[PDB]
Ligand binder design. Structure first.
Ligand SMILES: C[C@H]1c2cccc(O)c2C(=O)C2=C(O)[C@]3(O)C(=O)C(C(N)=O)=C(O)[C@@H](N(C)C)[C@@H]3[C@@H](O)[C@@H]21
Ligand SMILES: C[C@H]1c2cccc(O)c2C(=O)C2=C(O)[C@]3(O)C(=O)C(C(N)=O)=C(O)[C@@H](N(C)C)[C@@H]3[C@@H](O)[C@@H]21
Ligand SMILES: [Cl-]
Ligand SMILES: [Cl-]
Ligand SMILES: [Cl-]
Ligand SMILES: [Cl-]
Ligand SMILES: [Cl-]
Ligand SMILES: [Cl-]
Ligand SMILES: [Cl-]
Ligand SMILES: [Cl-]
Ligand SMILES: [Cl-]
Ligand SMILES: [Cl-]
Ligand SMILES: [Cl-]
Ligand SMILES: [Cl-]
Ligand SMILES: [Mg+2]
Ligand SMILES: [Mg+2]
Lengths: 203, 203
Protein backbone atom coordinates (compact mmCIF):
# COMPACT_ATOMS: atom_id res chain seq x y z
CA UNK A 1 0.00 0.00 0.00
CA UNK A 2 0.98 3.73 0.21
CA UNK A 3 4.37 4.41 2.03
CA UNK A 4 4.33 8.23 2.52
CA UNK A 5 5.25 9.23 6.12
CA UNK A 6 1.55 9.72 7.13
CA UNK A 7 0.54 6.19 5.84
CA UNK A 8 3.56 4.52 7.57
CA UNK A 9 2.64 6.28 10.87
CA UNK A 10 -1.09 5.24 10.45
CA UNK A 11 -0.04 1.55 10.02
CA UNK A 12 2.57 1.68 12.85
CA UNK A 13 -0.02 3.07 15.36
CA UNK A 14 -2.54 0.42 14.20
CA UNK A 15 0.20 -2.25 14.80
CA UNK A 16 1.10 -0.71 18.20
CA UNK A 17 -2.56 -1.24 19.36
CA UNK A 18 -2.41 -4.94 18.15
CA UNK A 19 1.06 -5.90 19.53
CA UNK A 20 2.18 -3.38 22.23
CA UNK A 21 5.65 -1.73 22.14
CA UNK A 22 7.68 -4.97 22.90
CA UNK A 23 5.93 -7.02 20.10
CA UNK A 24 6.02 -4.08 17.60
CA UNK A 25 8.63 -5.02 14.95
CA UNK A 26 9.55 -3.58 11.48
CA UNK A 27 8.90 -7.19 10.18
CA UNK A 28 5.25 -7.02 11.43
CA UNK A 29 4.92 -3.42 10.01
CA UNK A 30 6.11 -4.70 6.60
CA UNK A 31 3.42 -7.53 6.71
CA UNK A 32 0.68 -4.92 7.58
CA UNK A 33 1.78 -2.58 4.71
CA UNK A 34 1.93 -5.57 2.27
CA UNK A 35 5.64 -4.97 1.47
CA UNK A 36 9.00 -6.78 1.76
CA UNK A 37 11.36 -5.82 4.65
CA UNK A 38 13.97 -4.11 2.33
CA UNK A 39 11.12 -1.90 0.86
CA UNK A 40 10.14 -0.85 4.43
CA UNK A 41 13.88 -0.20 5.23
CA UNK A 42 14.05 2.61 2.55
CA UNK A 43 11.19 4.31 4.57
CA UNK A 44 11.85 3.20 8.23
CA UNK A 45 15.47 2.42 9.20
CA UNK A 46 14.77 0.63 12.53
CA UNK A 47 12.38 0.30 15.51
CA UNK A 48 14.09 3.24 17.40
CA UNK A 49 13.39 5.68 14.49
CA UNK A 50 9.78 4.42 14.31
CA UNK A 51 9.21 4.85 18.15
CA UNK A 52 10.82 8.38 18.05
CA UNK A 53 8.34 9.40 15.25
CA UNK A 54 5.25 7.78 16.93
CA UNK A 55 6.08 9.69 20.18
CA UNK A 56 5.95 12.97 18.14
CA UNK A 57 2.96 12.08 15.93
CA UNK A 58 0.81 10.83 18.88
CA UNK A 59 0.95 14.32 20.52
CA UNK A 60 0.63 16.06 17.09
CA UNK A 61 -2.62 14.17 16.33
CA UNK A 62 -4.21 13.79 19.76
CA UNK A 63 -2.70 16.23 22.37
CA UNK A 64 -4.97 19.28 21.75
CA UNK A 65 -3.89 21.26 24.89
CA UNK A 66 -0.18 21.91 24.13
CA UNK A 67 -0.71 25.71 24.48
CA UNK A 68 -2.52 27.97 26.95
CA UNK A 69 -5.70 29.81 25.94
CA UNK A 70 -5.41 33.65 25.75
CA UNK A 71 -5.51 34.92 29.39
CA UNK A 72 -5.42 31.39 30.97
CA UNK A 73 -3.71 31.19 34.40
CA UNK A 74 -0.58 29.00 34.67
CA UNK A 75 -2.50 26.80 37.17
CA UNK A 76 -5.30 26.17 34.65
CA UNK A 77 -2.78 25.70 31.82
CA UNK A 78 -0.82 22.97 33.72
CA UNK A 79 -4.12 21.19 34.66
CA UNK A 80 -5.50 21.23 31.05
CA UNK A 81 -2.02 20.37 29.62
CA UNK A 82 -1.64 17.36 31.98
CA UNK A 83 -5.20 16.05 31.30
CA UNK A 84 -4.55 16.35 27.50
CA UNK A 85 -1.03 14.77 27.78
CA UNK A 86 -2.56 11.87 29.83
CA UNK A 87 -5.41 11.34 27.26
CA UNK A 88 -2.89 11.26 24.38
CA UNK A 89 -0.53 8.77 26.19
CA UNK A 90 -3.52 6.43 27.03
CA UNK A 91 -4.91 6.51 23.46
CA UNK A 92 -2.38 3.84 22.26
CA UNK A 93 -1.25 0.59 23.95
CA UNK A 94 2.09 1.26 25.77
CA UNK A 95 1.73 4.94 24.79
CA UNK A 96 3.74 6.20 27.82
CA UNK A 97 6.56 3.71 27.04
CA UNK A 98 6.58 5.14 23.48
CA UNK A 99 7.03 8.70 24.94
CA UNK A 100 9.64 7.65 27.55
CA UNK A 101 13.29 8.68 26.97
CA UNK A 102 12.43 11.00 24.00
CA UNK A 103 13.38 14.68 24.17
CA UNK A 104 11.41 17.37 22.32
CA UNK A 105 11.72 16.95 18.52
CA UNK A 106 12.58 19.83 16.13
CA UNK A 107 8.83 19.80 15.07
CA UNK A 108 7.98 20.45 18.78
CA UNK A 109 10.54 23.26 19.43
CA UNK A 110 8.11 26.22 18.98
CA UNK A 111 5.48 24.46 21.21
CA UNK A 112 7.78 23.56 24.13
CA UNK A 113 9.59 27.03 23.93
CA UNK A 114 6.16 28.75 24.23
CA UNK A 115 5.33 26.56 27.29
CA UNK A 116 8.64 27.44 29.01
CA UNK A 117 8.28 31.15 28.07
CA UNK A 118 4.65 31.19 29.39
CA UNK A 119 5.82 29.81 32.82
CA UNK A 120 8.54 32.59 32.95
CA UNK A 121 5.92 35.29 32.01
CA UNK A 122 3.80 34.08 35.01
CA UNK A 123 6.67 34.79 37.49
CA UNK A 124 8.60 31.52 37.52
CA UNK A 125 12.33 31.60 36.84
CA UNK A 126 13.17 29.31 33.83
CA UNK A 127 14.53 26.77 36.41
CA UNK A 128 11.46 26.81 38.73
CA UNK A 129 9.21 26.83 35.65
CA UNK A 130 11.10 23.80 34.24
CA UNK A 131 10.90 21.97 37.64
CA UNK A 132 7.08 22.43 37.68
CA UNK A 133 6.75 21.28 33.98
CA UNK A 134 9.07 18.28 34.69
CA UNK A 135 7.12 17.33 37.92
CA UNK A 136 3.76 17.43 36.03
CA UNK A 137 5.36 15.44 33.14
CA UNK A 138 6.96 12.79 35.45
CA UNK A 139 3.82 12.46 37.60
CA UNK A 140 1.58 12.11 34.46
CA UNK A 141 3.90 9.60 32.70
CA UNK A 142 4.28 7.60 36.02
CA UNK A 143 0.47 7.43 36.45
CA UNK A 144 -0.04 6.34 32.79
CA UNK A 145 2.76 3.73 32.79
CA UNK A 146 1.38 2.25 36.10
CA UNK A 147 -2.08 1.90 34.44
CA UNK A 148 -0.73 0.61 31.07
CA UNK A 149 1.94 -1.73 32.53
CA UNK A 150 -0.70 -3.09 34.98
CA UNK A 151 -2.95 -4.07 31.97
CA UNK A 152 0.13 -5.59 30.22
CA UNK A 153 1.38 -7.72 33.23
CA UNK A 154 -2.29 -9.02 33.69
CA UNK A 155 -1.24 -11.54 30.94
CA UNK A 156 0.83 -13.36 33.68
CA UNK A 157 -1.75 -14.18 36.46
CA UNK A 158 -4.60 -13.87 47.37
CA UNK A 159 -7.22 -14.32 50.15
CA UNK A 160 -4.02 -13.55 52.21
CA UNK A 161 -4.37 -9.73 51.53
CA UNK A 162 -4.33 -7.64 54.73
CA UNK A 163 -7.41 -5.35 54.89
CA UNK A 164 -6.17 -1.81 53.94
CA UNK A 165 -4.18 -3.22 50.94
CA UNK A 166 -7.32 -5.25 49.88
CA UNK A 167 -9.44 -2.05 50.05
CA UNK A 168 -6.66 0.04 48.36
CA UNK A 169 -6.51 -2.42 45.34
CA UNK A 170 -10.41 -2.27 45.14
CA UNK A 171 -10.14 1.57 45.00
CA UNK A 172 -7.18 1.66 42.56
CA UNK A 173 -8.97 -0.71 40.14
CA UNK A 174 -12.32 1.22 40.23
CA UNK A 175 -11.20 3.35 37.14
CA UNK A 176 -8.21 3.76 34.67
CA UNK A 177 -6.49 5.79 37.50
CA UNK A 178 -8.41 9.05 36.58
CA UNK A 179 -9.61 9.85 40.18
CA UNK A 180 -6.12 9.25 41.74
CA UNK A 181 -4.44 11.22 38.90
CA UNK A 182 -6.72 14.29 39.17
CA UNK A 183 -6.39 14.42 43.02
CA UNK A 184 -2.56 14.23 42.78
CA UNK A 185 -2.53 16.81 39.99
CA UNK A 186 -4.32 19.39 42.26
CA UNK A 187 -1.87 18.61 45.12
CA UNK A 188 1.14 19.25 42.78
CA UNK A 189 -0.29 22.51 41.29
CA UNK A 190 -1.12 23.86 44.77
CA UNK A 191 2.42 23.00 46.01
CA UNK A 192 3.83 24.91 42.97
CA UNK A 193 1.64 27.87 43.89
CA UNK A 194 2.71 27.93 47.58
CA UNK A 195 6.36 27.98 46.35
CA UNK A 196 5.83 30.73 43.67
CA UNK A 197 3.85 33.04 46.00
CA UNK A 198 6.50 32.63 48.81
CA UNK A 199 9.28 34.49 46.84
CA UNK A 200 12.29 34.68 49.32
CA UNK A 201 10.05 34.10 52.42
CA UNK A 202 10.89 31.01 54.52
CA UNK A 203 8.11 28.54 53.69
CA UNK B 1 27.39 -22.57 40.18
CA UNK B 2 24.93 -22.42 43.15
CA UNK B 3 21.17 -22.13 42.13
CA UNK B 4 19.44 -21.30 45.47
CA UNK B 5 17.00 -18.34 45.12
CA UNK B 6 19.56 -15.83 46.58
CA UNK B 7 22.33 -16.92 44.07
CA UNK B 8 19.90 -16.79 41.07
CA UNK B 9 18.79 -13.25 42.13
CA UNK B 10 22.51 -12.16 42.58
CA UNK B 11 23.33 -13.36 39.00
CA UNK B 12 20.10 -11.88 37.49
CA UNK B 13 20.82 -8.40 38.99
CA UNK B 14 24.46 -8.64 37.77
CA UNK B 15 23.07 -9.52 34.26
CA UNK B 16 20.49 -6.67 34.45
CA UNK B 17 23.39 -4.14 34.95
CA UNK B 18 25.24 -5.66 31.86
CA UNK B 19 22.25 -5.96 29.44
CA UNK B 20 19.31 -3.75 30.64
CA UNK B 21 15.74 -5.12 30.95
CA UNK B 22 15.13 -5.60 27.13
CA UNK B 23 18.42 -7.60 26.61
CA UNK B 24 17.98 -9.61 29.87
CA UNK B 25 17.09 -13.19 28.81
CA UNK B 26 16.91 -16.55 30.69
CA UNK B 27 19.42 -17.81 28.00
CA UNK B 28 21.98 -15.14 29.08
CA UNK B 29 21.24 -15.93 32.81
CA UNK B 30 21.95 -19.63 32.13
CA UNK B 31 25.36 -18.69 30.48
CA UNK B 32 26.27 -16.49 33.55
CA UNK B 33 25.36 -19.31 36.02
CA UNK B 34 27.32 -21.87 33.90
CA UNK B 35 24.23 -24.09 33.37
CA UNK B 36 22.06 -25.42 30.50
CA UNK B 37 18.68 -23.71 29.81
CA UNK B 38 16.58 -26.72 31.06
CA UNK B 39 18.54 -26.63 34.41
CA UNK B 40 17.70 -22.90 34.77
CA UNK B 41 14.01 -23.68 33.87
CA UNK B 42 13.61 -25.90 37.04
CA UNK B 43 14.61 -22.71 39.03
CA UNK B 44 13.26 -19.79 36.86
CA UNK B 45 10.21 -20.51 34.66
CA UNK B 46 10.40 -17.39 32.43
CA UNK B 47 11.52 -13.73 32.17
CA UNK B 48 8.20 -12.45 33.75
CA UNK B 49 8.76 -14.54 36.95
CA UNK B 50 12.39 -13.32 37.10
CA UNK B 51 11.37 -9.57 36.70
CA UNK B 52 8.57 -9.99 39.35
CA UNK B 53 11.19 -11.37 41.85
CA UNK B 54 13.89 -8.72 41.02
CA UNK B 55 11.27 -5.94 41.62
CA UNK B 56 10.70 -7.42 45.15
CA UNK B 57 14.35 -8.24 45.94
CA UNK B 58 15.67 -4.80 44.80
CA UNK B 59 13.52 -3.04 47.47
CA UNK B 60 14.24 -5.83 50.05
CA UNK B 61 18.03 -5.33 49.65
CA UNK B 62 18.34 -1.61 48.97
CA UNK B 63 15.15 0.35 49.98
CA UNK B 64 15.99 1.04 53.67
CA UNK B 65 13.17 3.62 54.28
CA UNK B 66 10.04 1.44 53.79
CA UNK B 67 8.77 2.35 57.31
CA UNK B 68 8.49 5.56 59.34
CA UNK B 69 10.75 6.16 62.35
CA UNK B 70 8.96 6.25 65.76
CA UNK B 71 7.26 9.70 66.01
CA UNK B 72 8.12 10.74 62.38
CA UNK B 73 5.58 13.10 60.72
CA UNK B 74 3.78 11.82 57.60
CA UNK B 75 5.45 14.66 55.63
CA UNK B 76 8.94 13.50 56.68
CA UNK B 77 7.99 9.84 56.11
CA UNK B 78 6.83 10.47 52.49
CA UNK B 79 10.03 12.53 51.77
CA UNK B 80 12.41 9.84 53.22
CA UNK B 81 10.35 7.01 51.61
CA UNK B 82 10.47 8.69 48.15
CA UNK B 83 14.25 9.44 48.38
CA UNK B 84 14.88 5.76 49.41
CA UNK B 85 12.50 4.39 46.69
CA UNK B 86 14.29 6.60 44.07
CA UNK B 87 17.79 5.42 45.24
CA UNK B 88 16.70 1.76 45.04
CA UNK B 89 15.14 2.15 41.51
CA UNK B 90 18.34 3.93 40.21
CA UNK B 91 20.71 1.31 41.69
CA UNK B 92 20.11 -1.10 38.71
CA UNK B 93 19.94 -0.37 34.95
CA UNK B 94 16.23 -0.06 33.94
CA UNK B 95 15.33 -0.44 37.64
CA UNK B 96 12.06 1.59 37.30
CA UNK B 97 11.01 -0.54 34.29
CA UNK B 98 11.62 -3.63 36.49
CA UNK B 99 9.25 -2.15 39.17
CA UNK B 100 6.59 -0.99 36.64
CA UNK B 101 3.29 -2.94 36.47
CA UNK B 102 4.07 -5.03 39.63
CA UNK B 103 1.67 -4.92 42.58
CA UNK B 104 2.84 -5.50 46.16
CA UNK B 105 4.06 -9.09 46.66
CA UNK B 106 2.96 -11.33 49.58
CA UNK B 107 6.48 -10.73 51.11
CA UNK B 108 5.64 -6.95 51.04
CA UNK B 109 2.09 -7.16 52.53
CA UNK B 110 3.04 -6.26 56.15
CA UNK B 111 5.23 -3.32 54.89
CA UNK B 112 2.66 -1.74 52.53
CA UNK B 113 -0.24 -2.33 55.09
CA UNK B 114 1.82 -0.45 57.74
CA UNK B 115 2.38 2.44 55.27
CA UNK B 116 -1.36 2.69 54.48
CA UNK B 117 -2.30 2.36 58.19
CA UNK B 118 0.29 5.07 59.14
CA UNK B 119 -1.30 7.54 56.61
CA UNK B 120 -4.79 6.80 58.14
CA UNK B 121 -3.40 7.31 61.73
CA UNK B 122 -2.14 10.79 60.59
CA UNK B 123 -5.71 11.90 59.60
CA UNK B 124 -5.97 10.79 55.97
CA UNK B 125 -8.90 8.62 54.94
CA UNK B 126 -7.61 5.33 53.36
CA UNK B 127 -8.58 6.83 49.94
CA UNK B 128 -6.82 10.22 50.43
CA UNK B 129 -3.87 8.38 52.02
CA UNK B 130 -3.71 6.02 49.00
CA UNK B 131 -3.94 9.00 46.53
CA UNK B 132 -0.94 10.67 48.25
CA UNK B 133 1.09 7.37 48.28
CA UNK B 134 0.16 6.74 44.59
CA UNK B 135 1.08 10.37 43.58
CA UNK B 136 4.52 10.09 45.31
CA UNK B 137 5.00 6.61 43.71
CA UNK B 138 3.97 7.77 40.17
CA UNK B 139 6.00 10.99 40.40
CA UNK B 140 9.12 9.07 41.66
CA UNK B 141 8.82 6.25 39.05
CA UNK B 142 8.20 8.90 36.26
CA UNK B 143 11.33 10.87 37.31
CA UNK B 144 13.47 7.67 37.44
CA UNK B 145 12.21 6.24 34.13
CA UNK B 146 12.85 9.66 32.41
CA UNK B 147 16.48 9.58 33.72
CA UNK B 148 17.04 5.84 32.95
CA UNK B 149 15.28 5.81 29.54
CA UNK B 150 17.22 8.99 28.60
CA UNK B 151 20.56 7.13 29.27
CA UNK B 152 19.21 4.11 27.28
CA UNK B 153 18.02 6.09 24.15
CA UNK B 154 21.49 7.91 24.12
CA UNK B 155 22.61 4.74 22.20
CA UNK B 156 20.69 6.17 19.14
CA UNK B 157 22.24 9.68 18.56
CA UNK B 158 20.75 20.76 17.01
CA UNK B 159 22.18 24.32 16.79
CA UNK B 160 18.46 24.91 15.85
CA UNK B 161 17.39 24.82 19.60
CA UNK B 162 15.38 27.89 20.64
CA UNK B 163 16.94 29.56 23.73
CA UNK B 164 14.75 28.53 26.74
CA UNK B 165 14.70 24.84 25.56
CA UNK B 166 18.55 25.01 25.08
CA UNK B 167 18.94 26.36 28.66
CA UNK B 168 16.31 23.88 30.02
CA UNK B 169 18.25 20.85 28.53
CA UNK B 170 21.53 22.32 30.06
CA UNK B 171 19.74 22.45 33.47
CA UNK B 172 18.06 19.02 33.16
CA UNK B 173 21.39 17.35 32.26
CA UNK B 174 23.36 19.03 35.14
CA UNK B 175 22.60 15.98 37.47
CA UNK B 176 20.77 12.53 37.45
CA UNK B 177 17.50 14.57 37.96
CA UNK B 178 18.06 14.87 41.80
CA UNK B 179 17.49 18.70 42.01
CA UNK B 180 14.28 18.58 39.86
CA UNK B 181 13.01 15.50 41.79
CA UNK B 182 13.56 17.01 45.27
CA UNK B 183 11.89 20.36 44.28
CA UNK B 184 8.84 18.51 42.86
CA UNK B 185 8.69 16.24 45.90
CA UNK B 186 8.34 19.29 48.25
CA UNK B 187 5.61 20.77 45.97
CA UNK B 188 3.62 17.46 46.11
CA UNK B 189 3.98 17.04 49.93
CA UNK B 190 2.91 20.65 50.54
CA UNK B 191 -0.13 20.20 48.23
CA UNK B 192 -1.07 17.06 50.24
CA UNK B 193 -0.79 19.10 53.44
CA UNK B 194 -2.98 21.99 52.17
CA UNK B 195 -5.64 19.35 51.27
CA UNK B 196 -5.43 17.42 54.63
CA UNK B 197 -5.54 20.59 56.79
CA UNK B 198 -8.56 21.97 54.79
CA UNK B 199 -11.00 19.20 56.02
CA UNK B 200 -14.46 20.21 54.51
CA UNK B 201 -13.40 23.88 53.95
CA UNK B 202 -13.54 25.13 50.34
CA UNK B 203 -9.88 25.30 49.28
C1 LIG C 1 9.37 21.61 27.74
C2 LIG C 1 9.50 20.13 27.38
C3 LIG C 1 10.84 19.53 27.79
C4 LIG C 1 11.90 20.31 28.18
C5 LIG C 1 13.12 19.75 28.49
C6 LIG C 1 13.29 18.38 28.49
C7 LIG C 1 12.22 17.55 28.12
O1 LIG C 1 12.38 16.21 28.10
C8 LIG C 1 10.98 18.13 27.81
C9 LIG C 1 9.92 17.24 27.41
O2 LIG C 1 10.19 16.00 27.23
C10 LIG C 1 8.59 17.81 27.29
C11 LIG C 1 7.53 17.05 26.90
O3 LIG C 1 7.64 15.79 26.49
C12 LIG C 1 6.12 17.56 26.93
O4 LIG C 1 5.25 16.44 27.17
C13 LIG C 1 5.67 18.08 25.54
O5 LIG C 1 6.38 17.85 24.55
C14 LIG C 1 4.43 18.74 25.46
C15 LIG C 1 3.78 19.06 24.16
N1 LIG C 1 4.33 18.54 22.97
O6 LIG C 1 2.74 19.71 24.10
C16 LIG C 1 3.76 19.03 26.63
O7 LIG C 1 2.45 19.29 26.66
C17 LIG C 1 4.48 19.26 27.94
N2 LIG C 1 3.60 18.93 29.08
C18 LIG C 1 4.07 19.61 30.30
C19 LIG C 1 3.27 17.53 29.38
C20 LIG C 1 5.91 18.65 27.96
C21 LIG C 1 6.97 19.73 27.70
O8 LIG C 1 6.77 20.87 28.56
C22 LIG C 1 8.39 19.19 27.89
C1 LIG D 1 0.90 0.67 49.29
C2 LIG D 1 1.54 0.14 48.00
C3 LIG D 1 0.53 -0.11 46.90
C4 LIG D 1 -0.83 -0.12 47.13
C5 LIG D 1 -1.72 -0.41 46.13
C6 LIG D 1 -1.29 -0.62 44.83
C7 LIG D 1 0.08 -0.59 44.55
O1 LIG D 1 0.51 -0.80 43.28
C8 LIG D 1 0.99 -0.28 45.58
C9 LIG D 1 2.39 -0.29 45.25
O2 LIG D 1 2.74 -0.69 44.08
C10 LIG D 1 3.31 0.22 46.25
C11 LIG D 1 4.65 0.23 46.03
O3 LIG D 1 5.22 -0.31 44.96
C12 LIG D 1 5.61 0.90 46.97
O4 LIG D 1 6.73 1.37 46.19
C13 LIG D 1 6.25 -0.11 47.95
O5 LIG D 1 6.09 -1.33 47.75
C14 LIG D 1 7.05 0.40 48.99
C15 LIG D 1 7.90 -0.47 49.84
N1 LIG D 1 8.07 -1.83 49.49
O6 LIG D 1 8.52 -0.03 50.80
C16 LIG D 1 7.09 1.76 49.18
O7 LIG D 1 8.06 2.36 49.86
C17 LIG D 1 5.93 2.67 48.80
N2 LIG D 1 6.41 4.03 48.52
C18 LIG D 1 5.31 5.00 48.65
C19 LIG D 1 7.17 4.31 47.29
C20 LIG D 1 4.98 2.03 47.75
C21 LIG D 1 3.72 1.45 48.43
O8 LIG D 1 3.12 2.42 49.31
C22 LIG D 1 2.69 0.97 47.40
CL1 LIG E 1 -2.60 1.69 -1.95
CL1 LIG F 1 4.14 4.82 -1.89
CL1 LIG G 1 2.99 12.25 4.33
CL1 LIG H 1 12.19 -4.58 14.67
CL1 LIG I 1 10.68 10.77 29.41
CL1 LIG J 1 12.29 34.27 26.49
CL1 LIG K 1 29.54 -23.07 43.11
CL1 LIG L 1 22.54 -25.53 43.59
CL1 LIG M 1 18.25 -18.71 49.09
CL1 LIG N 1 14.02 -14.88 28.06
CL1 LIG O 1 3.77 0.57 38.63
CL1 LIG P 1 -6.42 -0.45 60.04
MG1 LIG Q 1 8.88 14.41 26.87
MG1 LIG R 1 4.63 -0.62 43.19
Amino acid sequence: SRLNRESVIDAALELLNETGIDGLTTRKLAQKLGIEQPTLYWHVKNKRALLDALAVEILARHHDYSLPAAGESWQSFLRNNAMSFRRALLRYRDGAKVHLGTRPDEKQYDTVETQLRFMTENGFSLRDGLYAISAVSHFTLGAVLAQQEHTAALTDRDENLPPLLREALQIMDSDDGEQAFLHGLESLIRGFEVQLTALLQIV
